[PDB]
Design a protein around this ligand. Structure first.
Ligand SMILES: [Ca+2]
Ligand SMILES: [Ca+2]
Length: 152
């Protein structure tokens, strides 16, 4: 009913690509219908930057509005630094994700470019596993609690 879903998020210059999406370096997405949140994660040398968007549906389209940004930075001795910032509406992109009816290898594509490219949402189990492992990591309570308590 409200099970969350994970996505790989390659960025491609064309908005109508259908082929092998794994030739591109992906970000990761996580849709949480139980909370009305969409998370987008970017990896920089093992540190994670996660945007928490709020979303609503517009028919089949997922409309995503910036919320907060969580940074998770590994440090010596298996420590993590977790920090949270409010995202700016002016400086963090919004997304509208629309279906890809003609491509079975993607679930959605963005309506607008970011840095010249379209992000796709490609359904993916491993992306889901990555988020769910991070939520439940004993060191990540600050992140889990932000998400669990969000808007509430
Ligand atoms: Ca599709
Ligand atoms: Ca097939």
């Amino acid at each position: 009913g409200n099970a969350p879903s994970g996505y790989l998020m390659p960025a491609i210059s064309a908005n109508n690509f259908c082929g092998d999406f794994t030739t591109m370096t992906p970000d990761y997405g996580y849709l949480m219908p139980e909370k009305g949140l969409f998370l987008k994660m970017h990896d920089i040398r093992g540190a994670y930057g996660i945007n928490i968007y709020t979303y609503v549906m517009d028919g089949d389209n997922i409309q995503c509005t910036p919320g907060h940004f969580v940074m998770i930075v590994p440090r010596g001795g298996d420590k993590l630094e977790i920090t949270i910032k409010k995202s700016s509406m002016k400086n963090t992109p919004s997304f509208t994700f629309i279906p890809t009816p003609d491509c079975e290898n993607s679930a959605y594509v963005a309506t607008e470019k970011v840095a010249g490219k379209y992000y796709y949402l490609c359904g993916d189990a491993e992306a889901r596993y990555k988020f769910e492992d991070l939520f439940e990591d004993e060191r990540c309570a600050e992140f889990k609690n932000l998400v669990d308590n969000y808007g509430k």
